């Protein structure tokens, strides 16, 4: 969109394509085509007597914290 156009002249693109079938993968992992990222919002809660796996799955992932 228009923003990209004003953004690109700075050298910044926001493409973020992964080369895997079906799977998303993360910012910076090698082989990703593009130099941007795509984000989203997830907040979910669960008890058992299981947060991650509910509603939106980010399951089986190696998380890296950025703050």
């Amino acid at each position: 969109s228009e923003l990209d156009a004003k953004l690109n002249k700075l050298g910044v693109d926001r493409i973020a394509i992964s080369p895997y079938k079906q799977w998303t993968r993360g910012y910076m992992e090698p082989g990703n085509i593009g130099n941007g990222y795509v984000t989203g919002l997830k907040v979910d809660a669960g008890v058992r007597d299981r947060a991650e796996t509910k509603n939106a799955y980010i399951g089986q992932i190696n998380m890296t914290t950025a703050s």
Binding site: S1, L3, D4, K6, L7, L10, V12, D13, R14, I15, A16, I17, S18, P19, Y20, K21, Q22, W23, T24, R25, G26, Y27, M28, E29, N32, I33, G34, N35, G36, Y37, V38, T39, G40, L41, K42, V43, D44, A45, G46, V47, R48, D49, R50, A51, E52, T53, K54, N55, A56, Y57, I58, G59, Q60, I61, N62, M63, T64, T65, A66, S67
Partner: protein, 229 residues
């Protein structure tokens, strides 16, 4: 956290759920610049991300088995005990967490911010919690507001939401927030191709979440408000 010049939020910027302009604030707050920053419930966005990643059963475009998804997150866990309803301090009756995204007025200069926070709760009537939460929003909200001045950066709208669960019995309960940072796969982009990287992006940037679902042949899941948080 932040989402900057390289960013696009699933739901707002790409794959838009209709809901978003259909929405209407909970309220507004003065910023140091002076603009009334509208705050809206984050239901649409959250819901979007579900449609895209999918659920454990309805698996759609989820992070690859074994990948390194850098994320902004905080988590929290505690028990509400076997019966011993006596509190060894890291225990509570309920657990809660929240995330807040405030889109930057000008993405050429300032960065959009995520603010996510969480905790545990020591009462056991749901109303008291519910109440604390709806209050909390305004804290986060005014917080988003004075937040800009260091950066001399003013926002344009903050979207905020929550997840809680009330426990009892010796269950342990967890609550989290997570902003992930992913790169999209080819087949999530109808008529995308590994040779058309930026066009591939503008296709996702031009479909509304509905449209996307239809071309992909995926039944909705946000649909008629059916996702709890």
């Amino acid at each position: 956290x932040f989402t900057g010049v390289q960013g696009r939020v699933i739901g707002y910027d790409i794959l838009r759920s209709p809901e978003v302009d259909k929405a209407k604030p909970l309220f507004t707050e003065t910023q140091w610049d002076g603009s009334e920053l509208p705050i809206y419930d984050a239901k649409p966005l959250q819901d979007a991300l579900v449609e895209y990643f999918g659920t454990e059963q309805d698996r759609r475009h989820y992070p690859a088995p074994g990948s390194f998804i850098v994320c902004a997150n905080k988590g929290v866990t505690a028990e509400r005990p076997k019966n011993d309803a006596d509190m060894k301090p890291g225990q509570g009756y309920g657990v809660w967490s929240a995330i807040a995204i405030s889109f930057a007025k000008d993405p050429t200069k300032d960065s959009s911010m995520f603010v996510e926070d969480a905790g545990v709760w020591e009462t056991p009537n749901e109303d008291e919690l519910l109440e604390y939460l709806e209050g909390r929003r305004k804290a986060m909200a005014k917080s988003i507001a004075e937040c800009g001045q260091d950066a001399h950066a003013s926002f344009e709208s903050s979207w905020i939401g929550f997840a809680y669960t009330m426990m009892e019995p010796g269950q342990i309960g967890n609550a989290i927030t997570v902003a992930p940072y992913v790169s999209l796969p080819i087949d999530s982009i109808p008529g995308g191709s590994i040779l058309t990287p930026d066009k591939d992006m503008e296709i996702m940037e031009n479909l509304t979440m509905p449209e996307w679902l239809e071309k992909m042949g995926y039944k909705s899941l946000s649909a008629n408000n059916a996702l709890k948080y």
